[PDB]
Design a protein that fits this description.
part of a larger assembly, 5 chains, A: 189 residues, mainly alpha, two-stranded antiparallel sheet, 2% strand, B: 260 residues, alpha/beta, 5-stranded mixed β-sheet, 6 helices, 70% helix, hydrolase, ATPase, Complex, kinase
């Protein structure tokens, strides 16, 4: 209302995992968004374990959200789906059974998948690494930058558990400088 | 939707699950047989090389489409299209295409299609090898082409998934050279069959996984449906009992309302 | 079942726990037992009871027939307390064993071809069998 | 009791082989040994047509039997299950494939 | 169904049998018919009638589709009486027909998947086809 905003985030747990249950059906009729956590994603080490394909949000429409945000979201989701399909192909055929387009799609999908992980401020009292609060602008800009494959050279292991996208480039360049120094010192012996 | 039908479906799924293990055993045995034969073929090819040595750029690219059409075959076909677009020129190279897919690929690239065949010809090695040997002898006598290679849209384990390929040429003179060509073609077909059998084993494992997932889904649906039906039946049965005792409830309500 | 079958069991099992020094200072640990039918975890009362306790130990009939005693299925069994319920020495000793057990099961069910990755294959086939 | 023993041997009919029927579930709460008969095994002419793999007894332990009896029973059950597994392979791929 | 639906059928069907000379000396043979829905023999009335009668002759819709006439399911049908209800010549003539039919049905079901069959398998197929 004009007085303010009351936002609600409601946790639902249906015993026996039945989402056609009348309680689940009744509650889903009011949800404007869903955050679905995946056990497979947690097993792979993706934290938070939010599934970006099974979940949905009604705010990804033209009535509210800007066109570029919708384009970025759609491209990210379809790239993740194609990457999953190509990884299923890879696990049987092998990596070098794809063309260059498929390999680029796989690389972009992997970097998108590991870019979505993030450390939490509320969990830094037993993990050491400080948490992050990435603004929407930074998230959109970094996802757009990764989408075009502008960082496909940077190893995938650098992407995990980071905030803004620029920290990836900083870490990569620092490691490259240290490796260059070690190579120069290795040639001096 | 009765428990009898669910039991029949689950017994069919379990029978299929066992049969897939049996198929794995059979495929492994056939793979062992094929490898044992291929070792002898390799030794015979080496001996034939030695005996030919005792008795002694236009390329004919030959492409072969995969056995079936699925996601793996489509990915391999697009990789083959990339490779052909890379290392084939329409002026200095001639392409022999068997199967609709590679024929369409060549026609789209407008390469020099000397002749077209049918995929079933590859099923029997003798006829395909004989026709290819006659064609290459005709081409070499006429000096149309120099090098000969074979491409099959099929993944290979030794290449980390790369397409199987080998340049046979270069490496009664005519009879000996023809026999060497035939032995080379036989070896190539045997290698292709070996890789196909390994892929088939992995596909069998995938099929077993799919069967288990189907069984889980069927269990879920049966449980939900039976719960719903049982609850409805119990409520409908109690409806009669609760209807038949309305007067006692109404009289109790009256006498409680009056009370003291 | 009656309409309040969940309340009957929740108000019963919520009387256990650890209490403060001013309110008794003791504890009550409860180990309720539930029977399933042919592995049907999705039954009414079993799913009511799972959503009340702090985890479950699931006993498998397949392991019992195979001769494993006690026939406890580690994959379907949970303990939500986790290392918080273990002593420091036990938490240090048993750190990351469930992951190794699941990896060993995954490898055993999917050995497939005789091709072997590295010595790590023997490492898993050794430590998993030792755990078993 | 001190006066003697009362042993019971009770026959039950399972409708449509539904072992989750409430009557069967009530009955298994009291049975000390279950002997399960098979119509396929009877149809093969095998009598008394008792299924050895499905049936089990609580008295086949070391508390009541010897080491030899337990070893023989375990080896027999293992051999029967293994040959049941291998018979399907024999039927499909032939007896030579073993 | 009413509470005594089993009684009204058991008391009706137990009136048939063979009687001694002092009590009539006759016999009454009963052939009741029962309909199942999609093969579900787990219904209440089919279960009661199976519990009451001395044997059951099952008619199958799958066998009707396959072309069998009459589509009698031998593997499901039972006759508790057996050779006791047969003449001596008939009992001698039909000693091991059920076993042959069972073996033939198993082999015929597996024939669509198997590839190699022994000579005993060929003779079993011939005998089963002749029996059908």
């Amino acid at each position: 209302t004009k007085d303010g905003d009351i936002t609600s985030i409601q946790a639902m747990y249906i015993p026996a995992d039945d989402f056609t249950d009348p309680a689940a059906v009744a509650a889903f009729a009011h949800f404007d968004s869903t955050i679905i956590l995946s056990r497979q994603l947690a097993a792979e080490g993706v934290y938070p374990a939010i599934d970006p394909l099974e979940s949905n949000s009604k705010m990804l429409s033209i009535k509210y959200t800007s066109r570029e945000h919708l384009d970025i979201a759609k491209k990210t989701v379809q790239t993740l789906e194609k990457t999953k399909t190509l990884e299923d192909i890879i696990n049987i055929l092998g990596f070098d059974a794809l063309s260059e387009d498929d390999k680029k799609v796989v690389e972009v999908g992997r970097r998108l998948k590991w870019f979505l992980t993030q450390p939490f401020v509320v969990a830094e009292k037993f993990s050491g690494v400080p948490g992050k609060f990435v603004r929407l602008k930074d998230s959109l800009k970094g996802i757009k930058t990764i989408l075009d494959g502008d960082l496909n050279h940077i190893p995938v292991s650098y992407f995990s558990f980071v905030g803004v996208v620029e920290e990836i480039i900083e870490k990569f360049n620092l490691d490259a400088k240290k490796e260059a120094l070690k190579n120069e010192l290795e040639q001096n012996q | 939707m009765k428990r009898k039908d669910v039991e029949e479906k689950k017994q069919n799924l379990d029978f299929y699950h066992n049969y897939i293990d049996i198929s794995k055993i059979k495929v492994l045995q056939k793979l062992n047989e094929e490898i044992a034969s291929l070792n002898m073929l390799k030794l015979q090819k080496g001996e034939s090389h030695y005996l030919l040595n005792r008795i002694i750029r236009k390329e004919l690219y030959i492409l072969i489409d995969p056995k079936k059409l699925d996601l793996f075959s489509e990915a391999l076909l697009r990789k083959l299209s990339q490779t052909v677009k890379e290392r084939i020129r329409p002026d200095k190279d001639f392409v022999i295409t068997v199967g609709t897919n590679v024929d369409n690929i060549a026609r789209q690239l407008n390469l020099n299609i000397i002749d077209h065949y049918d995929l079933d010809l590859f099923n029997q090695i003798d006829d395909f090898a004989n026709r290819i040997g006659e064609l290459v002898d005709v081409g070499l006598n006429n000096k149309i082409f120099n090098y000969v290679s074979l491409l099959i849209a099929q993944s290979s384990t030794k290449n980390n998934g790369g397409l199987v390929q080998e340049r046979i040429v270069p490496f009664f003179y005519e009879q000996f050279v023809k026999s060497v060509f035939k032995q080379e073609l036989f070896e190539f077909k045997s290698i292709s069959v070996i890789e196909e059998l390994k892929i088939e084993l992995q596909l069998l494992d995938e099929k077993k996984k799919r069967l288990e997932e189907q069984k889980k889904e069927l269990i879920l649906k049966w449980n939900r449906a039976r719960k719903e039906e049982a609850t409805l039946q119990s409520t409908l049965l109690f409806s009669a009992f609760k209807v038949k005792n309305q007067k006692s409830t109404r009289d109790e309500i009256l006498r409680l309302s009056k009370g003291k | 079942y009656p309409g309040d079958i969940f309340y009957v069991h929740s108000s019963l099992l919520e009387r256990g726990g650890k209490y403060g020094p001013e309110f008794g200072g003791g504890s009550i640990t409860i180990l309720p037992i539930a029977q399933t039918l042919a592995g049907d975890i999705s039954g009414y009362i079993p799913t009511n009871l799972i959503s009340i306790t702090d985890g479950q130990i699931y006993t498998s009939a397949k392991l019992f027939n195979e001769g494993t005693r006690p026939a406890i299925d580690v994959n379907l069994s949970v303990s939500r307390l986790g290392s918080a319920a273990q002593s420091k020495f036990m938490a240090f000793a048993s750190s990351g064993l469930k992951k190794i057990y699941t990896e060993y099961k995954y490898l055993k069910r999917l050995s497939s071809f005789s091709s072997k990755i590295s010595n790590r294959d023997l490492e898993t086939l050794q430590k998993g069998k030792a755990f078993e």
